[PDB]
């Protein structure tokens, strides 16, 4: 253990005050809604939690862009499927602890609702509230993400206008190490609901949700059919001296279905 | 029929598919094959209980049973009709309560739909020949 | 001198099992739920049975038993947890005429209790209740967590307090009606005071207790499962032959 | 120990939500009602269904929405207010035989639930009321009024509490019985305690939840929407082409 | 969990409660019990100089805390699951073959040989079968 690394980047007074989450929302759902005492208690990895800064990044490039809501707790977005609506805060840990030679800068916005998506330059970033980390601290950096909002819940249906929280590499990823290599300083996410999130009206789980992350078939790709020839996949491999970008037409598929 | 699997000895190898409840038959997936024929110009239809993507979407997810049926619901994606109601046993085969004489034919443009498990006594409403 | 009115008939009593009062010592965590799942009675995923007029007295019309898979809220909420404990509460539905006649008896089967076959006259040993086709109401009844261990698992090789529903007496219509007239019912369950799960894992797998769904793939673009075309078409014929010993295409629902 | 009555069966669950307390600082008046409105259940503008025994289950019977056009006196008053706040209270009576068997599940679908299509097992995991179609007395429920804006307008293209009715185990008489006995229902309503209007407007003008009222003339004194001439007869004929494609004569009931 | 750095000094001390259904536990008869399970959450950003190539080390070293106990004094028994497996004290050229009846001339090896065969004689489970 050393430290000349950067003890902590302990929040700063980000300048916002303090939200109201399930006080508002509750006399205006008919039911009494309760998530369980223990999911407060640990810090779970988010779904979109997982970033990476190599020093081929250039100052400005977005490293996560995430939404306050449900998605971002493998807790609640499971439990997002029998209800319909939420509100409240989230404290987001945000694990970036660089080797001891590499330096540079990131900053973490509290971007408000209705802001237009889109490019949001790096001599914007910093007219939100925001927190500059080093991508050397120890420590996780505990950094809240408020319910600013215009009505009295969210439903859980991500047409939300809600509070993200982008990150913007600020200055860009560089090594003293004397040899042969630039370190890749991966981050990661961790979040956990504040003491008033809550949900609001049970309703049936149903999966098919705009939340529950891709799930591939467990069958070996030896045992698979080809999708351009009938006939069996005899071995995968990756090959540079091909054409790079073929505009084949069978087999190609979006994620999202069609 | 079995066709010879050892030289002229028995083998292992899957049970009958059965049983059903009294006025039930068994729901038969049809295609039609290729086939050298020096007389007849009929087409050969196979049979089969499950297709693919139904013998995959099993042995891929495994689901459990707790119970010993699936009723399932065949209704056409278009207005909603409800085409019949069958019974996909444990076993992987389906069956359906009909009391006709001769086949009955139905569209293939709808979308099985799991509505519950059902036990093994279960009463299905007939289909209408 | 008393009264000793003529008609009462109902209302199984019960003595109350500790939930996680004796599973606290020893489970990690004991984590509530949601406080509103107690106050309604959704439809069990097994909650679907007929009653025919070819049944014989002595049928069991459904047997369930006490978990989590018998409620889709906890059935939903036990991927997150390692382990149930507490009691429950069903009740069923019966939709029948004034013209059939019958009566069912749904029994609370303990635990290691001899699974053979109970008869007609071994039912009513057991805290029942009695209940005709006839009824507009639905009738309750506690499903109690009598065990021998602390907790249960949500990976049900494990015994627990089933529900067992006999007919009673057979089912016959006070008028000729219909011989193909079905006494549809359905059942319905809720936690009662004392349930609350064990141990928050992740979401873990697929799951158990996780409701089969099939493909959104309409049959014409399928493929058969014993020749390398196309499916052609759907059928029903009881002239072909009725249990055919095909061996492609086979599979249960399980995977294997 | 206790006992568990085995009939109690119904009287869903409220959290009572806030009506003129949320809108109160935000809107500029807060306006009573008669209080003899609240008393009285009258009869919805829709309230009208039937359920034939060609119906399958699954089927919505009706669907509802919260709001002033569920009472023909808060329709009328909601011509001079510009919004309004607060809960309902709905009853339906159905008109069955002693013959009919089935099941219908009245259930309370909240807003910005996912206008889809709700199943059998899933109509069942809301605050519902079960009830056959055999019942002498109505049955009613508390339409209550989640929302995430302090008020509604009385321009309802917002979202509001629903009241989905799903026909849950299929119509079939316990008797042969006919096949064109069609069950009639009918709903009705009146505010519960908590409703009231928002800002005094004048009736502003024809309006919306205005009822549709079609001119007394009779068809003799008409004329023809496709040629210059008066209405000489009406008829029906399954014979002439079922589906004509005419272009003239043609109209909304919006009046596009 | 707890999340570990790599470069940490001091050994990270935690506990490994006992989570059971059951009262206690029987000692000849392996059950369910709590686990603990490491796993490398980012990975691991070094310099190496030619050889070797710096893997970080890490042992796992545990002590009954203040209330583990035993149950009931039985007689001892030799046949337990926790008993390591032992070997024969017996040199390999003092052995007999086990594909033919002969004594054993020679132990070594040889790439050049099929690296995968398929004897039948010889082959045994370390477990007994
Ligand atoms: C050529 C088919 C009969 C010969 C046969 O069974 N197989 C030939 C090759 S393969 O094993 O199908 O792979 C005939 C009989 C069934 C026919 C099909 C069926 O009549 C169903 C539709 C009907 C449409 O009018 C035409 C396309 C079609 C999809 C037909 C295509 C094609 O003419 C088919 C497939």
Same mark, same amino acid.
């Given at each position: ?258 | ?17 059965? %049983?059903?409840? %009294? ?107």
């Amino acid at each position: 253990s050393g430290q000349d690394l950067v003890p902590a980047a302990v929040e700063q007074a980000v300048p916002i005050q303090p939200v109201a989450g399930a006080a508002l929302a509750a006399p205006a759902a008919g039911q009494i809604n309760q998530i369980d005492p223990w999911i407060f208690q640990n810090f779970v990895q988010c779904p979109l939690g997982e970033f990476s800064i190599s020093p081929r990044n250039t100052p400005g490039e977005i490293l996560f862009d995430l939404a306050l809501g449900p998605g971002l707790n493998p807790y609640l977005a499971h439990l997002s499927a029998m209800y319909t609506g939420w509100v409240g805060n989230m404290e987001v840990q945000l694990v970036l602890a660089g080797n001891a030679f590499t330096a540079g800068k990131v900053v973490v916005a509290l971007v408000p609702p209705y802001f237009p998506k889109g490019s949001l330059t790096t001599a914007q970033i910093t007219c939100f509230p925001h927190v500059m980390c080093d991508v050397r601290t120890l420590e996780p950096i505990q950094l809240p993400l408020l319910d600013v909002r215009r009505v009295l819940w969210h439903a859980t249906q991500d047409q939300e206008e809600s509070m993200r929280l982008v990150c913007m590499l600020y200055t860009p990823l560089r090594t003293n190490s004397p040899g042969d290599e630039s370190f890749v300083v991966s981050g990661r996410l961790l979040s956990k609901p504040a003491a008033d999130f809550n949900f609001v009206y049970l309703t049936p789980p149903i999966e098919r949700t705009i939340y529950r992350m891709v799930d591939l078939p467990v069958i070996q790709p030896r045992l698979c059919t080809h999708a351009r020839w009938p006939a069996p996949v005899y071995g995968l491999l990756v090959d540079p001296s091909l054409p790079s970008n073929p505009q084949w037409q069978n087999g190609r598929v979006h994620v999202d279905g069609t | 029929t079995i066709p010879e699997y050892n030289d002229g000895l028995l083998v292992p190898l899957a049970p009958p598919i059965g %049983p059903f409840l %009294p006025g039930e038959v068994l729901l038969r997936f049809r295609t039609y094959m290729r086939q050298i024929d020096t007389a007849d110009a009929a087409a050969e239809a196979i049979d089969c209980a499950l297709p693919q993507e139904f013998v995959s979407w099993f042995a891929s997810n495994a689901f459990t049973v707790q119970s010993e049926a699936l009723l399932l619901r065949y209704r056409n994606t278009l207005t909603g009709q409800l085409l019949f109601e069958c019974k996909l046993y444990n076993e992987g085969y389906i069956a359906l309560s009909y009391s006709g004489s001769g086949p009955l034919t139905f569209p293939t443009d709808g979308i099985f739909e799991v509505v519950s498990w059902v036990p093994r006594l279960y009463q299905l409403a007939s289909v209408g020949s």
